[PDB]
């Protein structure tokens, strides 16, 4: 159970590295390098 909880936390924080189809996993760079009406679409895709 201790390992299962640890693995669940590890996968959850590894899912932040996932892009989910967005141009990049990092939120700050895509927010900085994209204009509002397409950055919001990418941010929404990452949020979903």
């Amino acid at each position: 159970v201790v390992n299962q909880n640890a693995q669940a936390l590890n996968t959850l924080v590894k899912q932040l590295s996932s892009n989910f189809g967005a141009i990049s996993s990092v939120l700050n760079d895509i927010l900085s390098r994209l204009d509002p009406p397409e950055a919001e679409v990418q941010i929404d895709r990452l949020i979903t």
Partner: protein, 48 residues
């Protein structure tokens, strides 16, 4: 307050209790299931 009913005989009954102990061990592979024999859907999946 002074009367008791006592059985002068007995019946040996048999009762059937059915309990499920297991289910079919079904395995589904994601890469084959959602992305059929195509690489590009697998590349899109890797973003997830």
């Amino acid at each position: 307050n002074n009367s008791i009913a006592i059985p002068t005989n007995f019946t040996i009954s048999v009762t059937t209790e059915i309990l499920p102990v297991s289910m079919t061990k079904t395995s589904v592979d994601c890469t084959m299931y959602i992305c059929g024999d195509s690489t590009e859907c697998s590349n899109l999946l890797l973003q997830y």
